[PDB]
Amino acid sequence: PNFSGNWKIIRSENFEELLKVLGVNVMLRKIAVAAASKPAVEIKQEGDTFYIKVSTTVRTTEINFKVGEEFEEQTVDGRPCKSLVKWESENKMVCEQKLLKGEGPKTSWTLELTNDGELIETMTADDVVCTKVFVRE
Template sequence: MVQFTGKFTRVSAENYDEFLKALNVGFILRKAATASTPVMEITESDGNWSMKTSTSMKSMELKFKLGEPFEEETSDGRKCTTTVTMEGNKLITDQKAIKKGEKDVRAVREFFDDKLIISMTCDGVTSTQVYKRD
């Protein structure tokens, strides 16, 4: 079984600006997001998971139990009901926007021995990011 926990640093991002546009993220926030080099740290203890993503500008932490919906305020300001599930070597995050007119996002984190590949989809636009395991 592949290791889910650990520290990962983003090394590439495809279609990220287009994905952020689909989410209605403004120009300045998009530029900051695409220029940053996030570090993601994933931990788990007794079924309690934490995904902390840090950049030089800010840090965000998600705390969850697999399969249990929770309320989240995303980095772009949406309030969502979010559920994280595990399928094989993947953690799948489904964000359902609470406010009418806001967007839903599905993020699939696929884990390998040396890296993590995240595919995020909103309104049919997908961004793929590669993080190397530190």
């Protein structure tokens, strides 16, 4: 699959609740929800190597990874972590996260490309799942 493109959000489900059960305070939840309501997502894929940039009104996050190789990023609530992506299937990658310092809920994310070119993201903390769906610009 080729995930490359500039992606715009079309659906978001359970994001604030994911932040809440993580302990993110209400002021910050409100800012984070609003800031991320129309994010800019840029993906550049070259085989198993990815660059992903996500920008909200107030924040930019950039990650660089190759499938099967550990890299550093942050969890959804901003804690630094060591991550590892694998292909679950031809069209779907899954990322397991391990905190750099300390302990916390089990967090992960997934990205899946559908036949009509939609991008599905999931983000999980323990038993709480958030789903977002994007389309190419």
